[PDB]
Amino acid sequence: LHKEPATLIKAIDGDTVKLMYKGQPMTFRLLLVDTPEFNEKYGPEASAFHKKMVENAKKIEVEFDKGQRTDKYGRGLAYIYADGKMDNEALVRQGLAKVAYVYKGNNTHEQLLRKAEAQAKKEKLNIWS
Ligand SMILES: Cc1cn([C@H]2C[C@H](OP(=O)(O)O)[C@@H](COP(=O)(O)O)O2)c(=O)[nH]c1=O
Ligand SMILES: [Ca+2]
């Protein structure tokens, strides 16, 4: 898999972010995770975490997996990196997201994220508390 450039247009919530990718604005949905919606428990903390992470990055990168790159709502499906740290993994590791939506052939980083979830659960972080 390959990291591609992008620039933040706007933070949205725990598992979506608006980025300019190949010069076009797009909403990206983070692969392999699910954050609570803003109005549910840990929802505001997940949004806040993701926001900070994307707003502080000097470099944002998009990494598509091997399968579909856009979902049925037209959102980009990617692993997103902020200064080389994966947003998807960071949210899971903090117990602000669960591993979820694991479809065959867009699941390269499945085991990496499950490992982060196991550590977050061990530490009883946030969602696991
Ligand atoms: C993460 C992801 C979500 N989706 C779709 C599945 C869900 O359909 P439904 O809307 O029909 O439930 C929805 C979940 O996204 P959200 O968690 O952003 O709502 O997005 C995919 O199709 N592919 C994926 O890789
Ligand atoms: Ca969600």
CATH of the domain at 117: 2.40.50.90
Q: How was this structure determined?
A: X-ray
Pocket test residue of 16, 18, 29 for ligand 1, highest count of atoms within 8 A of CB: 29
Query: Could you identify the atom of ligand 1 that is nearest to the CA of residue 34?
Result: 17
Whole domain around residue 6: which residue ranges? Answer: 1-129
Q: Ligand 1: which residues within 6 Å by Cβ?
A: 29, 31, 34, 71-72, 77, 101, 103, 106
Strand (E) or helix (H) holding 111: helix 110-122
DSSP 8-state class, residue 29: E
The answer to whether residue 37 is catalytic is yes
Burial of 125 per CB tally in 10 Å (0-12, 13-18, 19+): middle
Question: Minimum-distance ligand to the CA of 46?
Answer: 2
Distances (CA, A) of 107 to 9, 18, 50, 67, 77: 26, 22, 21, 9, 11
Task: Give CA 122 to chain center in angstroms.
Answer: 21
CA of 125 to the centre of ligand 2 (A): 18
Please give the resolution of this entry in Å, rounded to 1 decimal.
1.8
Closest-CA residue, ligand 1 atom 5, reads: 71
Considering its fold, how many domains does the chain have in total? 1
Q: For residues 88 and 94, is the Cβ–Cβ distance under 8 A?
A: no
